[PDB]
Amino acid sequence: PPLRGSGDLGVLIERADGSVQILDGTAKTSLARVEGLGDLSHASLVFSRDQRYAYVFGRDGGLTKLDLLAQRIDKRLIQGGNSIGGAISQDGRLVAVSNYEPGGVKVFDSRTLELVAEIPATRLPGQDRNSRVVGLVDAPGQRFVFSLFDSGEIWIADFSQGDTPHLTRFRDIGKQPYDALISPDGRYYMAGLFGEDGMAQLDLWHPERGVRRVLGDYGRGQRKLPVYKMPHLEGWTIASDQAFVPAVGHHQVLVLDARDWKQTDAIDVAGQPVFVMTRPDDRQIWVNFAYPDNDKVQVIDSETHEVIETLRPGPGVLHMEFSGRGDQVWISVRDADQLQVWDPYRLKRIGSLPARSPSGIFFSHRAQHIGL
Amino acid sequence: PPLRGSGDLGVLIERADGSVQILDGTAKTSLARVEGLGDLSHASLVFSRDQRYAYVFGRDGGLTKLDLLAQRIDKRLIQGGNSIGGAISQDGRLVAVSNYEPGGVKVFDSRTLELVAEIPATRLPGQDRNSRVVGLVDAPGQRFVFSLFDSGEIWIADFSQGDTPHLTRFRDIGKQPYDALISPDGRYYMAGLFGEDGMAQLDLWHPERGVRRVLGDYGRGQRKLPVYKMPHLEGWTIASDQAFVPAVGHHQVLVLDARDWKQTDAIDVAGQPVFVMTRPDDRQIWVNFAYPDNDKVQVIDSETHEVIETLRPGPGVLHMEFSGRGDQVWISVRDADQLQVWDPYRLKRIGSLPARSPSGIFFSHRAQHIGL
Numbered sequence A, B: 001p002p003l004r005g006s007g008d009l010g011v012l013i014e015r016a017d018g019s020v021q022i023l024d025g026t027a028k029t030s031l032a033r034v035e036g037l038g039d040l041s042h043a044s045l046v047f048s049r050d051q052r053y054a055y056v057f058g059r060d061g062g063l064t065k066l067d068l069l070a071q072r073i074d075k076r077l078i079q080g081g082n083s084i085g086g087a088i089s090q091d092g093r094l095v096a097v098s099n100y101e102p103g104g105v106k107v108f109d110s111r112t113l114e115l116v117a118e119i120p121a122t123r124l125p126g127q128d129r130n131s132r133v134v135g136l137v138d139a140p141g142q143r144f145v146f147s148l149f150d151s152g153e154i155w156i157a158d159f160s161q162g163d164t165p166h167l168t169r170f171r172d173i174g175k176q177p178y179d180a181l182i183s184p185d186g187r188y189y190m191a192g193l194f195g196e197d198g199m200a201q202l203d204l205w206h207p208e209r210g211v212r213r214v215l216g217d218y219g220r221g222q223r224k225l226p227v228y229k230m231p232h233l234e235g236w237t238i239a240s241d242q243a244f245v246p247a248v249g250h251h252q253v254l255v256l257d258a259r260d261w262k263q264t265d266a267i268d269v270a271g272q273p274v275f276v277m278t279r280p281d282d283r284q285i286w287v288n289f290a291y292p293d294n295d296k297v298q299v300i301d302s303e304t305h306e307v308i309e310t311l312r313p314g315p316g317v318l319h320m321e322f323s324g325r326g327d328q329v330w331i332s333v334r335d336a337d338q339l340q341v342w343d344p345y346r347l348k349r350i351g352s353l354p355a356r357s358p359s360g361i362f363f364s365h366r367a368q369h370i371g372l
């Protein structure tokens, strides 16, 4: 195809056919459909630092280096036991992916997808297995950070000095961390706890100070909810003074003081929130919901904490993505087979695109952001 | 040329020969030199939202739409009296350039450079011309915000409704505002005052509240300094709680409290700071200086406020720019005819490219952020 910029290119997961659509953000058009990515029933992706490639992580353990400008699979591998939610290094040269079988982290060359290092997780007793790994993120200083669900640990893999990483292991951080996130500035790593309440906070500027428990009331409490009903921590959105986050098993969006990490408000919403995101200018908070309320998107004023409109794009709204500067918000409607574009300032739809069971929608500006 | 991504492309201003270099950030090489941009003795630029084009604003009033993938001038126009420091709109369709003769702001279409809107400044009660316009920035909500030097006014031009802007005028904001910045979140507009000490702050979320005076001790005061010794308000760095700024006429970098806008610390530096910058992880402050100390760059620990090291890349260090994720910092060394690439974590030079009197260095990741 002809020359084009990479700044407005997006990748849409088509959930039921293992295919993706490459999108032109400015024109609001579909450039192509690419097939052969296997099981994208649940998928995540990151972008290369030049924004030409997407690294697609599938639930079949597949890692697809997708060439966005040539509209083709550049390279692809499949490793059973590889989880999704992988990350790309600060210098863009390393792609890290979690695995539950055996249990650990594998880091690959971003250019050739050749294995660079394997970090086995802590061994478990009575099993030919290691601990499951969750909450994998990239971090400043050529690091990856991740948590061990079964053993209760947060590890730092430091690749500053080349292909052999230097590990820093923190034990006894909390029972069963199920997920984690990295703060926008890349300073604080926080893993949510499933076997108990609170977050395991790690100051990456001062790892020597250890791990800190914060937000002690947040969690399943004494409720016996299964681990797959715990929130997506990518569904958190953190701002300067506040964080807007999904409640655990309640129809509330919690407002947290981000300096002391304590809840100060709870906004009643039309369902169990999954993803709580912010308009890039931080004025509004956008929320999607879990079934049976997953036909709605609610917009919340970040100042008054009040719901200002309830959108109904259609059945099965799974994911939302804003543009770099915020002139657009993209909303995938799975069971309508549409990818809708909306004006987040006029709260009006500005175009739809046919898609087959669309789910995740990602835009290449993520390439420039730690933790994305 | 061949296919490539736009996410790592840099544009270097060669201020002596009316030329620029297009740089491959990942390969740390030069892709091309493009000539014929006239007077770049002083210049700035912004990127289109797909990152394929740069809009260079020259001292000659020239506005060049440079094609970084075809490595050629796509469109150019020259309008005497135009200033540099133009901005691009939130949806990317409008490019604004300020005027100093007669005084005002002109807005062009990003694709054709055809004129869209002429906004003349306040006519001066006496002369045949208007106030000079200074401190033009893009803001969320499809707005352009600028200050009127002679009149002491802050205007907001709102293109939300179309080509005809809705203007909001704030008068008696302070004497002779010479420059302005917009906070990284896109909420606060701050104009520095030359006719009197202090800064005029405007809350773009709540324009009904009007302009407000802050940091009343920042300025020349009793000293008879010229405009052109006042600081580059682009030389400010605003962290979430703190601001790192150049002192006015002093060899110091001031640490301020961004919430209360009061000075909490002062840092003795090796010269008059011009640009105070932050590594993208906010753990370091990078400082360059004006003649005769402009052969130095000082790296400050953002926490201890102590100088970690003093770099000496060469004579005539004019500007610096980081990669989006912080793995690189690019440093222009005018009198050595070198654009250097450093590792900001190892603090060691990893590249040095030839250039003709290099000055400003800009990378495509600015395309995604308000105010850049």
Ligand code: DHE
Residues within 6 Å of the ligand: A042, A043, A044, A045, A084, A085, A086, A227, A228, A229, A230, A232, A234, A274, A290, A318, A319, A359, A360
């Ligand atoms: C680790 C992980 C990511 C990648 C985040 C990252 O790092 O970028 C992810 C992404 C997602 C993304 C978008 C990609 C992203 O990374 O943000 C969406 C829309 C999503 C909607 C759901 N997820 Fe997801 N999800 C899990 C884990 C994850 N989901 C589970 O363990 C759980 C509870 C069990 C499972 O089914 O796998 C789970 C169930 C769901 C759902 O039930 C949702 C709501 C609807 C559905 O169809 O599965 N998950």
Ligand code: DHE
Residues within 6 Å of the ligand: B042, B043, B044, B045, B084, B085, B086, B227, B228, B229, B230, B232, B234, B274, B290, B318, B319, B359, B360, B361
């Ligand atoms: C408006 C403006 C921009 C655009 C900022 C933006 O939006 O990116 C700019 C950019 C710059 C940039 C980088 C481009 C950028 O986009 O910031 C640098 C390195 C720079 C180094 C100087 N500037 Fe600059 N500069 C002025 C105004 C400006 N300078 C002046 O009015 C003043 C005081 C007199 C003049 O000649 O214009 C002035 C003198 C200087 C210098 O003396 C400096 C320190 C050294 C030199 O010019 O050789 N200015």
